[PDB]
Each structure stands twice: as C-alpha cells, then as structure tokens.
Amino acid sequence: KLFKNLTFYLYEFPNTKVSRLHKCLSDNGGQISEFLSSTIDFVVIPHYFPVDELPIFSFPTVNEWWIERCLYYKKIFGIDEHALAKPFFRPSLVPYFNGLSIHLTGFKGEELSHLKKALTILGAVVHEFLGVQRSILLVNTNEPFSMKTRFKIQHATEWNVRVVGVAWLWNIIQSGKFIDQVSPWAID
Ligand SMILES: [Cl-]
C-alpha cells in the first residue's frame, strides 16, 4: 500500500469530509489518530483553512491536496515539492484577487484542478476559456509552450490581456503577499 506504516492527524475538517478522507487514507494502508504524538507522520489541514489561524505543529504539515497528489502520481512527495500541497490560504490576499478574471494555459491534470480551486478561494474568477475581457492570461512556464498556448498568448497580446508567467503567482502564494507589478514576469 502507498501510505503503509504512516499515521495521519486530521485537523479541523468538517464531519462529512473526515469520513471520506478517513476511507481514502485507510484504503491506502494509512492509519489515523486524533492525538498528537510521536506516532504521527503528517498533520493534514483543509486547503481553505487560513494559515494565520493555524496552531503550531511539531510535525510536517500539509493540506489534503498533498494526499491527492500522492495518489495521482502514486508516490510520496516531499512537503515542500509543491506550494499548493501546503497551507497557503490567507484572507488578506482576497481583496487583491477580487474582480480579477483569469484564464489558465499550459496546466494539465491535477495541477490545473488544484490551481483553479486555489485561485477561486483567493478571490479570483477562473474562466474556462480565453476571452477579450480577461484580466490575466496565466501561463505555465514550467512546461514547453504548446501550439494552443502560443495561440492564446498571441490573442491575449492583441486583445490587451495581461500575459503573466506563473512564477508571479507562486511567489504570491509562497510569500503570502500580493504583487502589484507583473512586468518582471511578463512573457511579451
Ligand atoms: Cl469563460
């Protein structure tokens, strides 16, 4: 099993989610304790839980998306391998993302799904399609540009949609502070 010999501690999850999350971990060889002890391998936080409201944990802390990532690629990642697998949500970022219409390009699978949800709770509106009236075209620069991505960039340039490298967003997530200037991450 994937989560063999691993004990998890679920923190402040709603009752409905707990049972579902319990079954997912249990069916993968993982155990769950409601106590903090040396047995605990990982502390799991809901992805929408405000970082600032989190208590101090003497254990590696991840969100439930870390579990989903582990199952998607069928292996155990480090806690710092992906910014969305850790607690990241800060309510102070919400007024900054508010009103921003964002379309994503170059992202696939679980990363795309998690990114949409991340941007949504942060106060932004994620659009399934590129339109003339998009605030931002967010480009995945960690992958070679597909033909479709290159098309969207050209259209965004013509339609005066801001073309921004994803590093800009990762920097906001990791630092916890919004960045008004996107020019250092523009593709142009
Ligand atoms: Cl749309």
Side-chain angles (χ1 to χ4, degrees), residues 1-3 5-161 163-187:
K1 315 301 288 294
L2 181 60
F3 294 140
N5 303 329
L6 294 185
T7 311
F8 296 88
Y9 171 87
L10 314 181
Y11 178 78
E12 289 300 291
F13 278 93
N15 291 333
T16 304
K17 183 62 178 182
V18 174
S19 301
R20 306 182 68 260
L21 195 58
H22 188 97
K23 179 181 179 59
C24 293
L25 287 168
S26 300
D27 295 341
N28 292 269
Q31 294 184 1
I32 299 186
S33 175
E34 298 187 4
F35 317 108
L36 293 176
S37 71
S38 56
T39 305
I40 299 300
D41 294 277
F42 296 98
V43 170
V44 186
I45 309 298
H47 67 263
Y48 50 87
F49 202 100
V51 180
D52 36 276
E53 295 183 7
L54 281 178
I56 307 177
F57 290 104
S58 300
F59 305 91
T61 299
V62 299
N63 60 32
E64 76 265 37
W65 288 351
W66 176 93
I67 303 176
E68 302 178 7
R69 281 184 52 89
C70 284
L71 303 180
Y72 190 90
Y73 302 95
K74 291 178 293 298
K75 70 175 183 179
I76 300 180
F77 299 91
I79 68 177
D80 296 327
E81 296 192 20
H82 201 281
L84 295 179
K86 285 180 299 299
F88 61 85
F89 177 71
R90 291 179 172 88
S92 58
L93 291 175
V94 183
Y96 293 95
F97 284 96
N98 247 90
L100 294 181
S101 55
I102 310 180
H103 176 65
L104 310 175
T105 180
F107 303 95
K108 294 184 178 181
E110 55 85 23
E111 189 181 22
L112 171 61
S113 182
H114 291 153
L115 191 54
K116 291 183 178 179
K117 298 175 178 176
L119 285 170
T120 301
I121 59 179
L122 285 174
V125 175
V126 183
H127 284 249
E128 295 293 337
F129 301 93
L130 175 65
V132 177
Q133 295 184 356
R134 304 291 178 267
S135 307
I136 295 172
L137 175 66
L138 197 63
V139 182
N140 185 15
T141 54
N142 297 325
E143 299 290 343
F145 293 170
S146 65
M147 189 183 194
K148 182 174 300 185
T149 290
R150 299 189 183 275
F151 285 161
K152 293 181 180 179
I153 292 177
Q154 296 170 180
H155 282 323
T157 299
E158 298 178 16
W159 301 340
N160 197 36
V161 177
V163 184
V164 181
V166 70
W168 166 77
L169 179 61
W170 299 135
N171 293 333
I172 295 183
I173 294 297
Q174 290 177 284
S175 66
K177 297 180 181 179
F178 192 78
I179 303 173
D180 296 331
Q181 289 79 8
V182 292
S183 56
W185 298 274
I187 278 73

